[PDB]
Each structure stands twice: as C-alpha cells, then as structure tokens.
Design a protein around this ligand. Structure first.
Ligand SMILES: [Mn+2]
Length: 118
C-alpha cells in the first residue's frame, strides 16, 4: 504494497514540516511552515518542493551545514494512505497515520498550495 506517506519535522533555519507522499514513483513533497492541520477545517500553507527518492521516506538524521536543507530530520508521523481524488490542482486522500488521519486535501491555486483536513 500500500502507498505510504511521511511527515518529517525538519529543524532547519526555519523550522518546518515536510509532507511526502509516495506518488508518481517518487516522494511528492510539500513543506508546511506551520505543520499539518489537526482539526477539521483548518487551512495550512503548503509549499511545493522538489520530488525526493522513495528511499528517503524512512530517513532520520542530520543534513549537514552548507548542504541545502541543512538541519535535523525526524519522523513526526507516517503511515499508509488511500488516494481518493487527483488532478493537477487537487489531491484528496485518506491518511492512516497516528496523528494525521482521516481525509485531507491539497489544493493548488494561483497563489500556491493549501493543505486542509476533513
Ligand atoms: Mn525540509
């Protein structure tokens, strides 16, 4: 296998979370400066970032300084997910994490992306 996701907590120059979905045979990724919404209706900024390799889904450790993406990476949540809807502008999925669970949607508009919880 079932597709999986991870939410990494990344202690870089700006502390953020990274949501990564196994999708298109890579990790489709978004930075979340304020984290995953944990309550219904809350709208969080999501910043599309470059695809990562599938192997990276289980990574934890320190990205060294001078490297782009420096800082400590820790797994905040992880699990399977079920894809419910997808287009170039919308991804709706059921997350099966310990913290991030139930349905969520990533929304692309002219201003970028948002992440929202059912
Ligand atoms: Mn990051």
């Amino acid at each position: 296998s079932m597709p999986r996701f991870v939410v990494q907590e990344h202690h870089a120059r700006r502390l953020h979370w990274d949501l990564r979905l196994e999708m298109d045979n890579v990790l489709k990724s978004w930075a979340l400066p304020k984290g995953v919404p944990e309550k219904r209706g809350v709208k969080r900024l999501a910043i599309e970032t470059e695809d990562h390799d599938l192997s990276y889904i289980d990574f934890e450790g320190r990205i060294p300084e001078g490297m782009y993406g420096a800082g400590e990476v820790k797994i905040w949540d992880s699990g399977e997910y079920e894809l419910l809807e997808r287009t170039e502008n919308k991804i709706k999925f059921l997350a099966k994490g310990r913290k991030m669970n139930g349905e969520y949607v990533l929304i692309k508009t002219k201003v970028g992306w948002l992440l929202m919880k059912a």
